[PDB]
Amino acid sequence: LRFVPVDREDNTYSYKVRYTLAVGDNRVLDMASTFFDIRGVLDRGPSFKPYSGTAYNSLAPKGAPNTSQWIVTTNGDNAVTTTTNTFGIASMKGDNITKEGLQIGKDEKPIYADKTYQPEPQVGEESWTDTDGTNEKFGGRALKPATNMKPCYGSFARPTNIKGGQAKNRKVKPTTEGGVETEEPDIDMEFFDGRDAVAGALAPEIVLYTENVNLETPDSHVVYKPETSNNSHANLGQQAMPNRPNYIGFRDNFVGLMYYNSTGNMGVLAGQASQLNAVVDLQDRNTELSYQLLLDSLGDRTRYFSMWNQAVDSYDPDVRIIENHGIEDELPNYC
């Protein structure tokens, strides 16, 4: 049988609840069979991290950056921002490139890469016997210099379309006829050629789809970064480390959720015929410790009961005292 509170009070750090425990006639009640049901909301906070490592690009080398661009200002006699200094990889292979990007198939009519999602960063050549030297055509994606340089390890950018494209929208499209601006993705196409490419032998070989994303590192921090500024060649080699784990949850046996051994916050159990309170409590007593030792005594303390949050605290015995047995490494290992 459930009892709805007859009075409730909220304070700054206390929640006062009052009930009317009515035991019916020809009945008994064991107080050990009674409990409080608490339903509420919890915001654990930004310090919560119930795991080790990173969830994004875990296999990446901790110094490996994405395909990203930086600006080389280098103003000499005049302000000549060189710019478009690029560093990365292009992994998709197409048949040809004319002006519209990477051709990805045919239908006569050649189909071209959709700038919103193509080229997919998750695809590439299928076998190691690529044997590619015959003037191939390759395409990829890159990060515009307007996005902050970050290691690949831990990098996340939210999707902005059903196809997985993470590009933002560039609101700066003011129509010249006094009309409202129009949203569209900030995806641009840059073309590259080889080293000699003197006068006429200028045919593109890599087409990169530069873009801007909502880059963020939600479970890792940078542990090495040379210059406080951003978007420099030196910043390609910043190293990243995962955030420390922090498991946040309710205490064992809900110790602390109820008030004990406080004279100003003392619980009340009284029959209404009188008003005298049968609960007298002192500040020299420890109720929580008494329950802990009791429930140690009456049962085994490695088993877990989810009802009372009955999960003892412990530590790894190999971490408190260190067994340095050495390392069994007689056999060499190779890659």
């Binding site: 200094n85 292009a90 590259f192």
Partner: protein
Amino acid sequence: FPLNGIGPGHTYQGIKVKTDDTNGWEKDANVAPANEITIGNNLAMEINI
């Protein structure tokens, strides 16, 4: 994988479309003459842990 993620690359120069009568490709000059980009997949070695 290599320390920098991708393996050794190649030198590349930026080029933009020609706005003149001939629609070819001329050297673009807001682009660096030496951009190191790798084509294909990166370098890797295999191990059975």
